[PDB]
Amino acid sequence: KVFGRCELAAAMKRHGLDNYRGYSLGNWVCAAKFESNFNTQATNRNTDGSTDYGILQINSRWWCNDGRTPGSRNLCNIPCSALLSSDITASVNCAKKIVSDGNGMNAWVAWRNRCKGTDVQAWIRGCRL
C-alpha cells in the first residue's frame, strides 16, 4: 500500500507514534517519506546481505526474520514480510523497540541525514489529526 502523507500521519498517530520517546509525529512521517516514499512494500538489499523492509525500512540483521540474513536476530519477533502489510501495526510496534534502543531516531540513517533538525512539522501541515 502507498499511503498518502496525511493518511500515514493519521495511521501513525492512531498507533501511538506521536511524541513516542519524544519524537513528534512530523519526525516519523519525514522518516517514512525518505525511507520508503510511504510505500509499505518497499524493500532494499544492503551490502552486508541484510534487507530493509516496509514504510520505515527495518533491517533483517537485528529486527525481523527473513530466513536469509546469516547470523541475524529477530528482536521484534516477526517475519520481515509482516512489515510489508497494508496494516502498519507490525512496523510501528517494531519501530517503538528500535527507537527505544539507545540512539533514538538516529537508528534511521535517512532520518539523521534528511529530517533531524529540519522543520519536521511541515510533514503534517494540513492534516486532520
Curated annotation (Swiss-Prot):
Catalytic residue positions: E35, D52
Binding annotation for substrate: D101
Record has Transmembrane helix as a keyword: no
Subcellular location: Secreted
GO biological process entries: cell wall macromolecule catabolic process; defense response to bacterium; defense response to Gram-negative bacterium; defense response to Gram-positive bacterium; killing of cells of another organism
Keywords: Allergen, Antimicrobial, Bacteriolytic enzyme, Disulfide bond, Glycosidase, Hydrolase, Secreted, Signal
InterPro entries attached to this UniProt entry: Glyco_hydro_22, Glyco_hydro_22_CS, Glyco_hydro_22_lys, Lysozyme-like_dom_sf
Disulfide bridge map: C6-C127, C30-C115, C64-C80, C76-C94
Pfam families, per database record: Lys
Catalytic activity: Hydrolysis of (1->4)-beta-linkages between N-acetylmuramic acid and N-acetyl-D-glucosamine residues in a peptidoglycan and between N-acetyl-D-glucosamine residues in chitodextrins
Single Gene Ontology MF annotation: beta-N-acetylglucosaminidase activity
EC number: 3.2.1.17
Domain (C-type lysozyme): residue spans on this chain: 1-129
Quaternary organization: Monomer.
Similarity comment: Belongs to the glycosyl hydrolase 22 family.
Extra information: Lysozyme C is capable of both hydrolysis and transglycosylation; it also shows a slight esterase activity. It acts rapidly on both peptide-substituted and unsubstituted peptidoglycan, and slowly on chitin oligosaccharides.
Function: Lysozymes have primarily a bacteriolytic function; those in tissues and body fluids are associated with the monocyte-macrophage system and enhance the activity of immunoagents. Has bacteriolytic activity against M.luteus.
PANTHER family, A to Z: LYSOZYME C
Protein name: Lysozyme C
Organism: Gallus gallus
Recorded name of the encoding gene: LYZ
